[PDB]
Design a protein around this ligand. Sequence first.
Ligand code: NA
Length: 179
Amino acid sequence: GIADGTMLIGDSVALRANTALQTALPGAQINAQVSVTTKTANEIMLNNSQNKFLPKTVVIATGVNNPENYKDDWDSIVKNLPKGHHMILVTPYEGDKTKETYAIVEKAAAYMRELAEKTPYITIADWNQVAKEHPEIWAGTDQVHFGSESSTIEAGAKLYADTIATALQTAQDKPVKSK
Ligand code: NA
C-alpha cells in the first residue's frame, strides 16, 4: 500500500550534494542536515513512517558522523525499516587514513556492504568505493566534504548524486520488506 517515492535522510555530506541530488533525482525528497547520524536517521525514519510521510524507497546517507557504534546502529536501522519499503545504504567515506577513526569508518562501510548483500530489500550505494577512485575531489579538503572549489565541489557532488541514482535504478526491480 505504501505509495511510490524516494526520501533521503542524510548527513552533511549528503547536504553538500543537495543541489546535485535534486537535479539527478527530480521529485525526490532530500532531507539532509549537518549533524545527522545513523542513530538520529533511525529515529527520523520511524517518525516519518508513523506520520505516513515515509515513501517506498528510503535512502540512509549517514555513517561518517559518530562511527563508533556502527554495528548496533546499522543492525538497528535495518531492523526497524517498516514493512513495505526498500532501503538504500550510502557507505561513509573518511579519506584521512591517519584519522584515529579511519579504521572504524572503513569497518562501517564494510558492514553495510554485508547487510546489503544479505538483505533482499536493501541495496548498496557505495560512496566509500567511489570516493576512493577520485582523489581529485579531495585535494585541499578535509577528506570528507568533497571539493576545494566550485569545480571540484560540483564534480564531487555529481559523483555522489549519481552513485545514489545508480543504486535506485538497481533497486527498481527488487522486493520491499514484507511479512
Ligand atoms: Na540486497
